[PDB]
Write a structure and sequence with these properties.
It is an enzyme of class 1 (oxidoreductase). The chain is about 45% helix and about 10% strand. By secondary structure, the chain is of the alpha+beta class. Bound molecules: protoporphyrin IX containing FE, ligand DSO and potassium ion (K). The ligand CN(C)c1cccc2c(S(=O)(=O)NCCCCCCCCNC(=O)[C@]34C[C@H]5C[C@H](C[C@H](C5)C3)C4)cccc12 binds next to helix 3, helix 8 and helix 11. Potassium ion binds next to helix 3.
């Protein structure tokens, strides 16, 4: 527990540990939702992980994400040392500079690119599911979720299929740290892969995402090799753990809820609505910002350089945003959330992510409608900047399935 800074009043101290919340065993969203109990202020200070603020309610989370002038993305991660080393584009950049980098990234992941990839995502989902179907079991996280978004990225980026295991190794090294290397070290190992490919595609560009990014124009001039590297790093990583972990939460819920499965089986037109409601209930990201100056925010004195965690996960779980927030209802009229963030850095991959989710659910429920958690398995969650599922053993009777 880091020493309490003099400017932080005692009554605001709640020692929440974002990497190991108490009662994690009861579900990660539930563990974070303790920050929304009635005796907890809207803005608290935890002495864990170096000490930082946490905004606990959707209203403050949204407001801080809007106010980039006070709440900077220069140091967006807890602990401070990771936030400082992090230089991905556009996620470590503030407006106004961020705007045009964001525009360039949008060219390679935006809605028209997604409408085009639709059928290719479907063919990949089908091949994975058909490979598992007659086995009557899988670890969903390992056997479907982990192979799926990396394969979509390779297609986007014109990278060879044979590079997948190495690239998976490099990205896992960075986002699932075991303590053997600093974030900085992992980032450099990732950059070492990207550097030659960027060099090759600035000399001989194709029409893949890396070529488009590495030869783009930003803020008047050509993008540097350095900036292209920093953007490619994000385009690769941004869609991996988020999608893997989110698909896992969703499938865990569906395995545990026969009635919700049956709803989507009987009413497949509800899957897009179901996707949105699961994005709210099983929201999973929590990054934040650093104070650019002393600032009073909702009656609380914040100090220049303080970090503030602004958990995207919490907005939609807030009972002030959605009534009975832990209840899943696919017919919810106004599904409010900030699962993809808010403000100037709102997820550029959100359209791609939704197709990945919807295609997965549609294809899985068509082929393997009836499945359960393996009996005696207790699903373990993990908490951090991207919270997730450690493993997801599923079982089914292959006689209830259909090759489609
Ligand atoms: C369920 C899946 C996903 C979730 C929950 C998610 C969540 C988020 C969040 C919360 C942010 C904002 C972070 C901040 O403000 O600091 C973000 C930004 C971003 N995401 Fe996603 N994301 C997902 C999938 C993807 C995918 C598939 C891609 C494709 C590569 C992607 C690419 C990006 C990029 C490029 C940004 C930066 C936008 C900017 O800085 O202007 N995301 N995402
Ligand atoms: C004791 N001290 C001080 C410590 C020292 C060292 C490590 C510590 C750890 S730690 O070992 O768990 N390290 C935490 C750092 C992990 C960050 C990696 C994510 C980057 C990739 N993702 C994105 O860019 C994105 C950016 C954006 C938001 C989000 C989703 C998408 C989009 C991708 C993330 C925990 C606790 C304490 C530690
Ligand atoms: K930084």
């Amino acid at each position: 527990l880091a020493p309490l800074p003099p400017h932080v009043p005692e009554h605001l101290v709640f020692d929440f540990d974002m990497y190991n919340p108490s009662n994690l065993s009861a579900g990660v969203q539930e563990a974070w939702a303790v920050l929304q109990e009635s005796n907890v202020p809207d803005l608290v200070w935890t002495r864990c992980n170096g000490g930082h603020w946490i905004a606990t309610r959707g209203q403050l989370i949204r407001e801080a994400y809007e106010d980039y002038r006070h709440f900077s993305s220069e140091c967006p991660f807890i602990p401070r040392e990771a936030g400082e080393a992090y230089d991905f584009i556009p996620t470590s950049m503030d407006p106004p500079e961020q705007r045009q980098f964001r525009a360039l990234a949008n060219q390679v992941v935006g809605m028209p690119v997604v409408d085009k990839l639709e059928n290719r995502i479907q063919e990949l989902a089908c091949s994975l599911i058909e490979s598992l179907r007659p086995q009557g079991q899988c670890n969903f996280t390992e056997d479907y979720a982990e192979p799926f978004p990396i394969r979509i990225f390779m297609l986007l980026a014109g990278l060879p299929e044979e590079d997948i295991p190495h690239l998976k190794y490099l990205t896992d090294q960075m986002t699932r740290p075991d303590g053997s290397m600093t974030f900085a070290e992992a980032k450099e190992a990732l950059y070492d892969y990207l550097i030659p490919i960027i060099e090759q595609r600035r000399q001989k560009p194709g029409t893949d995402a890396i070529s488009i990014v590495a030869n783009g124009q930003v803020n008047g001039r050509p993008i540097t090799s350095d900036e292209a590297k920093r953007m490619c790093g994000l385009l690769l990583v941004g869609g991996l753990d988020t999608v893997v972990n989110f698909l896992s939460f969703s499938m865990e819920f569906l395995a545990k809820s026969p009635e919700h499965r049956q709803e989507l089986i009987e009413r497949p037109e509800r899957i897009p609505a179901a996707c949105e409601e699961l994005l709210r209930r099983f929201s999973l990201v929590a990054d934040g910002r650093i104070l650019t100056s002393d600032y009073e925010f909702h009656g609380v004195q914040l100090k220049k350089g303080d970090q503030i965690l602004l958990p995207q996960m919490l907005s939609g779980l807030d009972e002030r945003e959605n009534a009975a927030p832990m209840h899943v209802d696919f017919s919810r009229q106004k599904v409010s959330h900030t699962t993809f963030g808010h403000g100037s850095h709102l997820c550029l991959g959100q359209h791609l992510a939704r197709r990945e989710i919807i295609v997965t659910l549609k294809e899985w429920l068509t082929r393997i409608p009836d499945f359960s958690i393996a009996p005696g398995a207790q699903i373990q969650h993990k908490s951090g900047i991207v919270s997730g599922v450690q493993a997801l053993p599923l079982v089914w009777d292959p006689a209830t399935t259909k090759a489609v």
